[PDB]
Design a protein around this ligand. Sequence first.
Ligand SMILES: Cn1ncc2cc(Nc3nccc(N(CCCO)c4cccc5[nH]ncc45)n3)ccc21
Length: 265
Amino acid sequence: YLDRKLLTLEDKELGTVKKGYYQMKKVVKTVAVKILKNEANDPALKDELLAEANVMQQLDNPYIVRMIGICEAESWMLVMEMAELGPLNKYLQQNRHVKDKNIIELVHQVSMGMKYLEESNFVHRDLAARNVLLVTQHYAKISDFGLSKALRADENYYKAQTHGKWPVKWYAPECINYYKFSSKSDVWSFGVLMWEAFSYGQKPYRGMKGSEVTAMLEKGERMGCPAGCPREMYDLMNLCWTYDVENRPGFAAVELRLRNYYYDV
Ligand SMILES: Cn1ncc2cc(Nc3nccc(N(CCCO)c4cccc5[nH]ncc45)n3)ccc21
C-alpha cells in the first residue's frame, strides 16, 4: 500500500483517471491513477481493479505496464507507471505518418510482452490497440489486465460460465462459441490489434453487430487488407485469425514473425 502524502494528482482528468507524481526513495515517478469513490462505488468495478492489481503484481516484463501500488485515502486508487503517449489507437489516428517499420516495431514489442504472458500462463482477454499504451513512439506496453486470468495448472484455457459483456470484435471463435480463453485466443485478438495498427486506429468490423461478426467469421470471411499495409503483415493477421484453435500459432511463433533480423526457430 502507498502513502497518500507522497502522491500528487493533477486535477485535469486523463470512471476517473488522473496523472500524478509519486515520490519514490530518491526520484519522483510519473504515474497514471484509476480512482474510485470510497463508499458510493460500484463493488464489481472495484473487484475488477483488485483482480487487475493481483495479476499485475506477479508480472515483470519491459512490455507490460508496471504497477506502483494501491492507495487507500480520500478515494481508492490504483497507481501505475505512466506510459505518457497513451493508447495506440488514438495515437495512430492523430499521427498518420508513422512508418511501417515503426508500426512493426511496436506490434513486435506487444508480441514480446504476450510471449512472456503466455510463458507465464496468464490470459489477457482484452488485447486491443486501445490497451497498448505508448511510452514513446518506439516503445509500447500492454495494459488493462481487468479481465486477465491465471490459468489452472492442468489446463491451457480459462472457462467462463457464459458470455458476459465482452470485446467480442477482438475475440476468437472458441471464446464466443465455448467461452474458452487460451493464449491462442489472445493471438486472435493480437491479429485484430495488428489490423487496427495498420489502419491508423480505425475500429475493426465497422458497422457490424457482434452476431454478424460471428457469422462472417464462421463462413471463413475476414477483414480485408488495410490500404498501404505491408503484405507480410496482412498475411500474419490472417494466420492469427486461424479458426481452429489447434492450428493457430501461439505467441512464440507470432513473435518470431515480427522480428526484423535473421534468426533460427
Ligand atoms: C490521454 N490518455 N487516455 C488514456 C491514457 C493513458 C495513459 N497512460 C497510462 N499509462 C499507464 C497506466 C494508465 N492507466 C490509465 C488507463 C486509462 O484508460 C491505468 C491506471 C490504472 C490501471 C491500469 N491498467 N491498465 C492501465 C491502467 N495509463 C496516458 C494518456 C492517456
